[PDB]
Design a protein around this nucleic acid. Structure first.
Length: 98
DNA sequence: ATATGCTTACCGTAACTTGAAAGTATTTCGATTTCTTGGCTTTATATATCTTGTGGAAAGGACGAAACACCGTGCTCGCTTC
């Protein structure tokens, strides 16, 4: 993921919306090593988290309404603090990064 | 004029995979051991035969002494010369 002349450190999505989203239907959620051979400028390490955080569906998003605080409470009430504790390993997709 | 907060590029460790080197109880080839089978000597009385030693023979070898070959020589025979 570094010192590579073929990688691109860009920020926007030039051609990515196709080059990376084709893997959605082309290949499953495993063996990312196969896709990196066709998409230039993109590495597997960043590709995994990009694919994950861009196409996910079930996430607590929207405006902070009068009913979201109970959601947060029952979230931190599942197993513990969650954000960094080891319980983060079983919280489904609620990693500390977010 | 700037903070809540999302997005996410790049800096970490944990369990699983693919292949090579070292390591573990298996079987077969080949060497080794041990089961045969016959001989190694010891005795006694018995004996006819048959191959081997102790005779003989003698072919196979050189070295020796006298004879013969010619040829010198003076004897014992010849001669010219005075």
């Amino acid at each position: 993921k570094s010192l590579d002349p073929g990688l691109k450190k860009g920020y926007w999505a030039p051609e990515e919306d196709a080059k990376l989203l084709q893997a959605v239907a082309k290949y499953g959620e495993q063996d990312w090593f196969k896709i990196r051979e066709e998409v230039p400028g993109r590495s597997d390490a960043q590709c995994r988290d990009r694919y994950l955080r861009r196409l996910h569906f079930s996430l607590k998003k929207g405006r902070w309404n009068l009913k979201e605080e109970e959601q947060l409470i029952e979230l931190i009430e599942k197993y513990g603090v969650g954000h960094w504790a080891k319980i983060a390993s079983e919280l489904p997709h609620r990693s500390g990064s977010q």
